[PDB]
């Protein structure tokens, strides 16, 4: 399994390293045949190649079978022209591999219900997966613009854009609890009706999966009032953005949230958290997101479901035994990772 | 105090009557000079005049000082062409009175924190007012449409539309805790930039009101993790739909919330809930939303602030003492209104 490791900036490096200590342990123990290489990306890349996604890195991604990314961004590279800012490096990553679906899990691990803003009974059992469409939507729709008197943007979606993202959703519900909820606004917008219809059409190919539709505004409050009944949620670009962030507040911390951007090319797995530059190098960063992103990589990129689960349970044990500083504990990056490993052997 | 009452369909008449019992009781006790007439609206008017907003109803709203609306809609008329559908009666009512701002209050009454899905700590003391732009945005933006391979909608906003709603937001901020949060998508959408710009500008005339900006995806997180820090939230049509629906979870249920539509003409006060046609006539419908709409009317249309507060508390006591069926209890419309009435003495 050839992995391209793009640590990035800030705490990216130390958390990505934490994940790597887990991968190697797993590798040594069962001979998975792991081969990974670290490439410059984001600010680290700018500081040497003048661009956030240099050619060596670009190739490293194409060659690998999966990408384990860390974090990007930092005040240093915030004065630079947009075309070379760390953030743009990520867009270039996505567009090169044509990643169109952004998987954003939200799971409340047993024992951690106390972290959620919801009462324990409601949080208990949450394990939703928001699948957002990245490439199209009002974020990219033409025409658009503004003058002194008015502004306008266009929410546009084509049949093929909606189909390929719907496929990823049905595909994942199958690995999960066979349930999919398509979120749209078919009661007012044409795009809503076109989205709903297209999802229903793709849905026929997965008779084993229960499909349901919901209006974005209705889904918003549903995710907060009873998120335990949802498995896979699939929606458009802008709606998925709102709903993903909404789902992320459920577990009770961003350090616990991993993610994956799937598409045509190399899968990209990376923690949701930012680069947190002022705590970088201090050794207190919570490696959970990165470790969990490694688990998603094992399962989804390498089909090692059983192995991905082990990592997931070890991490859960660790969170309870030695919670990191952001969970109210004292376990820095190293000590926390040690506890995880102490559950993988 | 000349009120125009438009009961509407389903439970509308049921809930509106519970509301009128309260208004009449306050009238006799305080000598308000209450005068009201009921008018056909929605399916009820369709059946009679073949139109959801007949001429006699229109003149009635124009001569009143405020409108108390019940519910609208029902499958009996759903098969009719949009142009005559009950839901259109609402649009015609809003346009005729040039209503451009929808006020959706999300408040957690002391003692009822228990009803919230959120931890008592975070739901405690919440009192947010979402001021949504009614006439405009993507819902009514041109061009729009769909083909067999694509669909599109247009989010367009002009300077006046924004100024009008913004002005109302700051104004309410003043009568409240003097803090407005403008919700947009400025970091990616021209309309967000345009909205923000225009709001910041209008904000110049209100130096005593604290303005703040937030992206809709960020607000979705904030309203769940720390909703109590907000006062007034002014935003666009669709964003307001989502944010309002979400804010409904804080108090507990969506059927306990009232709304108001302000503009240049006669203000409309109506419960956020639907007509629930299947429980129509069976009693059981919770009139809380209808009574609170009547409370909003007294406060915002007639300035009897102290009286609005008085009925808010009466329903709070009642929700706590004799909970309606949808709140897990068994107090039907009649029995519930009685309790409310008891605490009104």
Curated annotation (Swiss-Prot), chains A, B:
InterPro entries: IsoCit/isopropylmalate_DH_CS, IsoPropMal-DH-like_dom, Isopropylmalate_DH
Domain of life: Bacteria
Annotated compartments: Cytoplasm
A GO BP entry: L-leucine biosynthetic process
One CC-aspect GO term: cytosol
EC identifiers of the protein: 1.1.1.85
GO MF assignments: 3-isopropylmalate dehydrogenase activity; identical protein binding; magnesium ion binding; NAD binding
Binding of substrate, residues: 94, 104, 132, 217
Keyword Protein transport: no
Marked site positions, Important for catalysis: 139, 185
Catalytic activity: (2R,3S)-3-isopropylmalate + NAD(+) = 4-methyl-2-oxopentanoate + CO2 + NADH
Pfam families: Iso_dh
Top-level class of the enzyme under EC nomenclature: oxidoreductase
Cofactor note: Binds 1 Mg(2+) or Mn(2+) ion per subunit.
Entries under NCBIfam families matching the protein: leuB
Annotated function: Catalyzes the oxidation of 3-carboxy-2-hydroxy-4-methylpentanoate (3-isopropylmalate) to 3-carboxy-4-methyl-2-oxopentanoate. The product decarboxylates to 4-methyl-2 oxopentanoate.
UniProt name for this protein: 3-isopropylmalate dehydrogenase
The organism of origin for this protein: Thermus thermophilus (strain ATCC 27634 / DSM 579 / HB8)
């Amino acid at each position: 399994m050839k992995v391209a490791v793009l640590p990035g900036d800030g705490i990216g490096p130390e958390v990505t390293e934490a994940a790597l200590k887990v991968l190697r342990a797993l590798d040594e123990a069962e001979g998975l045949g792991l081969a990974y290489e670290v490439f410059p990306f984001g600010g680290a890349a700018i500081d040497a190649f003048g661009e956030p996604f240099p050619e060596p890195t670009r190739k490293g991604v194409e060659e690998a079978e999966a990408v384990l990314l860390g974090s990007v961004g930092g005040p240093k590279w915030d004065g630079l022209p947009r075309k070379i800012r760390p953030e743009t490096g990520l867009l270039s990553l996505r567009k090169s591999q044509d990643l169109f679906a952004n998987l954003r899990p939200a799971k409340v691990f047993p024992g951690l219900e106390r972290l959620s803003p919801l009462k324990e009974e409601i949080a208990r059992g949450v394990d939703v997966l928001i699948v957002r469409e990245l490439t199209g939507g009002i974020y990219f729709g033409e025409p658009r613009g503004m003058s002194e008197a008015e502004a306008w943007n266009t929410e546009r979606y084509s049949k093929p854009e909606v189909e390929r993202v719907a496929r990823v959703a049905f595909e994942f519900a199958r690995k999960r609890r066979k349930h999919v909820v398509s979120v749209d606004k078919a009661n007012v917008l044409e795009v809503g009706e076109f989205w709903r219809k297209t999802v229903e059409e793709v849905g026929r190919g997965y008779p084993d999966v229960a499909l349901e539709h919901q209006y974005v505004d209705a889904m918003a409050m549903h995710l907060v009032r009873s998120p335990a009944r949802f498995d896979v949620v699939v929606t458009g670009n802008i709606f998925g953005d709102i709903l993903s962030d909404l789902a992320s507040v459920l577990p009770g911390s961003l350090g616990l949230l991993p993610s994956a951007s799937l598409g045509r090319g190399t899968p990209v797995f990376e923690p949701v958290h930012g680069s947190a530059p002022d705590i970088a190098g201090k050794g207190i960063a919570n490696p959970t997101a990165a470790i969990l992103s490694a688990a998603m990589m094992l399962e989804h990129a390498f089909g090692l479901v059983e192995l991905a689960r082990k990592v997931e349970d070890a991490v859960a044990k660790a969170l309870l035994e030695t919670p990191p500083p952001d969970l109210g504990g004292s376990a820095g990056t190293e000590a926390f990772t040690a506890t995880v490993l102490r559950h993988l052997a």
